[PDB]
Amino acid sequence: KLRRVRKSPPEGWDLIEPTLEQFEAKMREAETEPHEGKRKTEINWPIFRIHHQRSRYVYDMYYKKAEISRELYEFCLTAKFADAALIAKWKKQGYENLCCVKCVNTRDSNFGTACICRVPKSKLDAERVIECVHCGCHGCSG
Amino acid sequence: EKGEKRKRVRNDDSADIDGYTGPWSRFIDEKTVAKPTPELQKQMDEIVKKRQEKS
Amino acid sequence: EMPPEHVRKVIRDHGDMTSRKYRHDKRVYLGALKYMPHAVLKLLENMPMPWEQIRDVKVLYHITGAITFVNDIPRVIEPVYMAQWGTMWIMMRREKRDRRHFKRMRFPPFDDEEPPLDYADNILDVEPLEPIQMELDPEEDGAVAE
Amino acid sequence: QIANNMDQAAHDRLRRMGRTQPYYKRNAPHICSFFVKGECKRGEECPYRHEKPTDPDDPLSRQNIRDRYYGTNDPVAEKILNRAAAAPTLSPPADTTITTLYIGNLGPSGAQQVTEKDLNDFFYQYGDIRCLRVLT
Amino acid sequence: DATEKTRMALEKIVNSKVASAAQYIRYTPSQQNGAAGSQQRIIRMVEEQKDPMEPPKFKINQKIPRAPPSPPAPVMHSPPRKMTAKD
Amino acid sequence: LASGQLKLSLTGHISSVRAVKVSPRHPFLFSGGEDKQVKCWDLEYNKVIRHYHGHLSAVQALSVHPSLDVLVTCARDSTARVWDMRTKAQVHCFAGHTNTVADVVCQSVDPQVITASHDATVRLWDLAAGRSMCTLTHHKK
Amino acid sequence: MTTAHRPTFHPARGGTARGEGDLSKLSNQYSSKDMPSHTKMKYRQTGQETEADLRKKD
Amino acid sequence: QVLRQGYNMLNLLIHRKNLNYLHLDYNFNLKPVKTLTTKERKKSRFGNAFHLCREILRLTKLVVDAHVQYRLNNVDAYQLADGLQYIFAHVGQLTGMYRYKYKLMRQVRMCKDLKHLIYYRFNTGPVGKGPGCGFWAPGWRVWLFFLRGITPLLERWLGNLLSRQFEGRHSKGVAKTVTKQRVESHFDLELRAA
Ligand SMILES: [Zn+2]
Ligand SMILES: [Zn+2]
Ligand SMILES: [Zn+2]
Ligand SMILES: [Zn+2]
C-alpha cells in the first residue's frame, strides 16, 4: 500500500499505523480462514466487516476525534486505507451507520428496493431479527 | 386506528479492533443458536433413522 | 467499487471447481467462456509499461468468480509516451552495452506441471525490484522530472 | 373433457367436499433440517421452520408431483375420498311400496312455520304429490 | 392498409427471430373467497435479471412428429369420366 | 426486349435455374434452381449478394411480393417458404401441401400468397398468420 | 433382394426443422452466413417507368 | 485470475464431455494421458474454437509469467522487458496458434519484420548482437490488433461450441447443399422426380 502512494505518510502516521497494521492482520486472516462449516453467504461477511471497521477508524480519527490532520486523513483515502465512497455515505444524514455500499445499491435488488437492513427498526415488526445476505448487518439505519 | 423494540449491544468504538460491533450489534436477547428439547430430539432421531433404514 | 479482498476470496474458494460446494456455479463458469477472449484482450492491453513496477488496474469481475475483465482503456499523452519510451531506448541500449552477460529468461518460465502461484501468498508481500527508469537530470529535465 | 363436463350431481358432490377457506399453512417455509439434526446454528435468524417433521410412516409425507398431477396413488386424495364416502346418505328402503317422505326441522307453529303452499311449490317440482300432510 | 398491417405483423417475427439466434397488473380473480375483502388484486410484475454469463439452460435437440394436418377439405371433383378398356 | 440481343449471361447456380423474378421495387433479380439455392442478384453489380438456404429440395417457383420486402419460394419439399428479403430470415414455412409445390403468386391484399401443388389443391394463405385459410380442391390433377 | 439402394419413389416433405413452427426452436448455434449483411435495402429510383406513369406514357 | 479462470473453464469443458483421459496442464498443453482407442480419439478431437482459445491463453500465460518472475525478484526489469520482447516476436514458436488459424502467419511475419527494424537500429555502435533488445511495444501492439478481430470470431465460435454442448445439436433436417461429388447424384434425383 504505502509503496503505491509515492509520498511519505505526512503527519502523525505513528498515531494510526499500529491500528491500521492490526486491521491488515485481521483482513488477511479473514481471507485465508476455511470456508467450511459456513453458509455460502457467510464467508464474505468478515471482509465487509473489517473493511467497515478500518474505514470507520480513519473516519473517526479525522472527523469525530480530530486527532489526525486533513493531509494525513486524505493520505489514507489516497492509500486506500479507507473507502472514500463509504465515508462519503457516512457524511449523509440517515446513512451515518451504513455497513457497506452494496446495501444501498437499489439497482442490484430484484424489486429495486434498498437492503432490508436499511429499514429503520421502528418500521419493522420490531421483534423480527435480520441478517442481510450482503454482510450480515442486523440493521444500520435507526 | 385510521392508519417495545429490543435493545442492541452496541460497541461503536471503531478503534476496538476485536470488540467493535457497528451494524452487527446483536440484540441482547438474541438466541444465536436454536436446539430442540430432548423430547423433540428423540422423536426426530427416529425419523431420520426410518428414512435412512430404506437402504 | 468494493474491497479487493472480495474477488480474491471468491476466486480462492471456488478453487479448482472440483468441489461440490460450488456445483451451482459450474454452468456459469462455462458460459463465461465465450467472453474469455475479451478478458485476454483487455488484460494484455493494460500490461504495465516497463518504467512501472506495479500497475493497479480497474477490474469488473463476475460476482461468482467466473471472469475478471480489466475495465480500463489505457490512454497516454503521446509526447509523454513517445518520450517515456525514448528513455527506454537509451536505457536498454546502455544496459546491453554495459552488462557482461545478459541471461534471457527461460520460456515457459514455469514448468507444465508447476501449479500457478497465489498472488497473496507469493507476490503481494515481496516488494518489487526497481523498474527501468532513466535518471533524469533535475536541472535540465526539471520541467518533466517530478 | 373438463371444460364441457356437465354431471351436475357430480359437481355438487365436489362442491360439498372442496375446502371453502383458503388454507395458507401450505405456504410456510420448509422445516429446518439443521433443527431436525438438532444443530440449527442460525438460531432465531433462521427463516425455515423449527418444528416437528411429518412422521415418515404417514403416507402424506411421501408424495410425488407426477402422482399428484396425473391423479394416481395420491395420499391426500384417498384421505378425502374415504371420508367423503363415509359421509351419511339417504337411500330408499327395501319397501318398494313406500313412497312417503318424512320432512322435519320445519320450526315451531306460527310465523316461523312453513306453509303447506311452501312445500307444495318446492316439491311439485319433482313429481306428482298424491297427498301432503302438515303437522305444525 | 394491408401492407402496413401485414408488415408490422411479420416484423415482429423477424426481429424476434434474428434475436432468437414500473409496470403492474390488476387481477380480478374468479375465486371470490379471495384476497381479504377484495374483488381485485394488484401486483407489481418485475422482470428477473438474466445473467449474461449463463449459457443456454435447456436442451432443444428434441424432435417430435408434426402436428396432424388440418381436417380434410372435401375433394369437390367433377364426376369421374368413364375409362373404356380401350383406354 | 425490343431487339432480342443477349445482354448478359449470369452464371452461378450449381444446377438448373427454374425460377426467375425481377423485383418490381428493387434493383434485384431473384432466382432459384434444382440445386435448392435461392439467390439475389444485385443488378447494380451483376453479382449474387444474398442466398436463402432452407429449401430441402428443388426450388420450383418463386414470387416477389409486390409491396413488402418479402420473397416466397416453392420446392419439391412440399413447402412454400417466406423470406425476409433483407436479413434472409425465413419468416414463415407454409407446410400445408402434401406434394411438391409447383407455383406461387403474391399480391398486396389478403390472400397475399396463393400456392398450387401436385396434390391437386390450390391454397390461399394468410401471410400475417402463416396459415392456409382456404383450400381449393377442385382440380383432379 | 436389395432395397436399401432405392430412389425417392415416396414424396419429399418438410416444414419441421430447427426454428420452423416456433421461433424459440432456433438453437443458439447459427451458421456463418447467418450474420447480418446487406442491411441497407436498395430501392429503384423515382421515375423508373413506374407502372401507372408507364400506363400514362401509353 | 484470468489464467485461473481460463484454465478452470477449459477443464470444465473437458470434464463436461467426460474426456477424463485428456489432461490440460498448467501451460495449457493438452496431453492424452493414455493411448487412445479409435472411439476415444474420435470423441476427444476438439476443434479450432477450443484450441485457438487454449493457445491464446498459452500466450497470455507466457506474458503474465514473465511479469510474475519479475515480481518474484528473480528476474530484473531489463530481463522482463527483453523477455516480453522475445515473446511477442516468437509467438509462432512459443505457441501453436498457427495450427488453428494459418492467417496468423500475417502477424508472425510482421513481428519478424519489426524485430529486424528494431534490432538493426538498436544494435548499433558498441551495442552488439545478442539478447537485451527489450523494446517490446511494436511487437505487443501487433497481437492486440490480432485480438481485436479474433475476439468476435471466438465469441461466436465458443458460443456455438457451448450452445450445442448445453442445448444439444438440433441440426437434423438442415438442408445439405450440393457440392462437387454430390452434383451427379443430385441430377438423377431431380430428373427421376420430374
Ligand atoms: Zn451491508
Ligand atoms: Zn444489508
Ligand atoms: Zn446494513
Ligand atoms: Zn433453522
UniProtKB/Swiss-Prot annotation, chain A:
UniProt xrefs under InterPro entries: BUD31 (IPR001748), BUD31/G10-rel_CS (IPR018230)
Keywords associated with the record: mRNA processing, mRNA splicing, Nucleus, Spliceosome
Domain of life: Eukaryota
Motif Nuclear localization signal: positions: 3-7
Subcellular compartments: Nucleus
UniProt-listed GO biological process terms: mRNA splicing, via spliceosome
CC terms in the record's Gene Ontology section: spliceosomal complex
Keyword Zinc: no
Function field: Involved in pre-mRNA splicing process.
Sequence similarity: Belongs to the BUD31 (G10) family.
Quaternary structure and partners: Identified in the spliceosome C complex.
Name of the protein in question: Protein BUD31 homolog
Organism of origin: Caenorhabditis elegans
Lineage, uppermost ranks: Eukaryota, Metazoa, Ecdysozoa, Nematoda, Chromadorea
UniProtKB/Swiss-Prot annotation, chain C:
Coiled coil: none
Protein name: Pre-mRNA-splicing factor 8 homolog
Function: Functions as a scaffold that mediates the ordered assembly of spliceosomal proteins and snRNAs. Required for the assembly of the U4/U6-U5 tri-snRNP complex. Functions as a scaffold that positions spliceosomal U2, U5 and U6 snRNAs at splice sites on pre-mRNA substrates, so that splicing can occur. Interacts with both the 5' and the 3' splice site.
Domain comment as written in the entry: The MPN (JAB/Mov34) domain has structural similarity with deubiquitinating enzymes, but lacks the residues that would bind the catalytic metal ion. Contains a region with structural similarity to reverse transcriptase, presenting the classical thumb, fingers and palm architecture, but lacks enzyme activity, since the essential metal-binding residues are not conserved.
Subunit annotation: Part of the U5 snRNP complex and of the U4/U6-U5 tri-snRNP complex.
Originating species: Caenorhabditis elegans
Source organism superkingdom: Eukaryota
Location of the protein in the cell: Nucleus
UniProtKB/Swiss-Prot annotation, chain E:
Top-level division of the source organism's lineage: Eukaryota
Protein name per Swiss-Prot or TrEMBL: Uncharacterized protein T27F2.1
Region (Disordered): 54-87
Record field: transmembrane: none
Origin species: Caenorhabditis elegans
Family stated for the protein in its record: Belongs to the SNW family.
Curated annotation (Swiss-Prot), chain G:
Subcellular localization: Nucleus
Annotated function: Component of a spliceosomal complex that is required for activating pre-mRNA splicing.
Bias (Polar residues): 25-34
Subunit structure: Component of spliceosomal complex.
Family of the protein in this entry: Belongs to the CWC15 family.
Transmembrane segments: none
UniProt protein name: Spliceosome-associated protein CWC15 homolog
Source species of the chain: Caenorhabditis elegans
